């Protein structure tokens, strides 16, 4: 079944179904049945939202690490999440005609030029979440959506497929995307997310995962100890970025220094990106949905 992780901000005004006026019912393809709703009260009174009503889902609520919040071009937010009579209500940024990044990844072969675009928007999104106090731990393609124009929309919430004899865990993630210090349950600083960013990059460029074993135990061992062959068809710039992200010591990883994501934005792999034009949504995606 599905587990949603809501990273709540300090002073979250908890909600309930009576706080939302119902406006439309949509079929949104991969998103299924979505309700368009209008917030009735509180600071965001009159705001329009998407609503999902899930019947078999668990809710986990976590504190951010950490002003009125502003929309980011490459993030969709979970604004409210509450349970009622066996139903889980999700109040989300409305994402008209959105789709899944995994759907695009299955259909296309990414070139380095393609990957530069998607990873650039994702780096802006991921760093913005860091500034809001959200560390992903197991950032993965399931967290990445695409809007109707083809731009990245990183979800600011967690989503896991968690299965009674099995004891429950407060954090259940996908091992293939977890940094070593996360695998060890010994650290989970924002630097862990830049390792996962590297896994994403590697998977986009090669269509394969860098660390994968027969079972979750062998994958852990590889993340901690394997020496990986760097694919030689990759450009010198792509190889350099992967090497700098795939440092086992989180303190030595690109993105972990004081300038954070700027260490990544300055890397030669992204040298063609105009980060201001990118933030203004003025650069067209390689694929249009």
């Amino acid at each position: 079944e599905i587990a949603i992780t809501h990273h709540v901000k300090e002073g979250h005004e908890k909600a309930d179904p009576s706080q939302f006026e119902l406006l439309k019912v949509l079929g949104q393809g991969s998103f299924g049945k979505v309700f368009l709703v209008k917030k009735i009260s509180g600071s965001d009174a009159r705001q329009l939202y998407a609503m999902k009503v899930l019947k078999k889902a668990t809710l986990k609520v976590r504190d951010r690490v950490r002003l009125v919040e502003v929309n980011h071009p490459f993030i969709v937010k979970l604004h409210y999440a509450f349970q009622t009579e066996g139903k889980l209500y999700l109040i989300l940024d409305f994402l008209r005609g959105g789709d899944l990044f995994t759907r695009l990844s299955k259909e296309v072969m990414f070139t380095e030029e393609d990957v530069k675009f998607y990873l650039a928007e994702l780096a802006l999104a991921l760093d913005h979440l860091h500034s809001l106090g959200i560390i992903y731990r197991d950032l993965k393609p399931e967290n990445i959506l695409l809007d109707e124009e083809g731009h990245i929309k990183l979800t600011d919430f967690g989503l896991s497929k968690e299965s009674h004899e099995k004891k429950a865990y407060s954090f259940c993630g996908t091992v293939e995307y977890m940094a070593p210090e996360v695998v060890n349950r010994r650290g989970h600083t924002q630097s862990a997310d830049w390792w996962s960013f590297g896994v994403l990059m590697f998977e986009m460029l090669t269509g394969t995962l860098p660390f994968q074993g027969k079972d979750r135990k062998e994958t852990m061992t590889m993340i901690l100890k394997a020496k990986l062959g760097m694919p030689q068809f990759l450009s010198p710039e792509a190889q350099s970025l992967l090497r700098m992200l795939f440092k086992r010591n989180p303190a030595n990883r690109l993105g972990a220094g004081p300038d954070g994501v700027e260490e990544i934005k300055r890397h030669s792999f992204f040298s063609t990106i105009d980060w201001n034009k990118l933030y203004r949504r003025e650069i067209h995606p390689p694929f249009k949905p």
Binding site: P210, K225, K227, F246, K247, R248
Partner: peptide, 6 residues
């Protein structure tokens, strides 16, 4: 090893 590749 701190370096994963090479």
């Amino acid at each position: 090893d701190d370096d994963v590749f090479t």
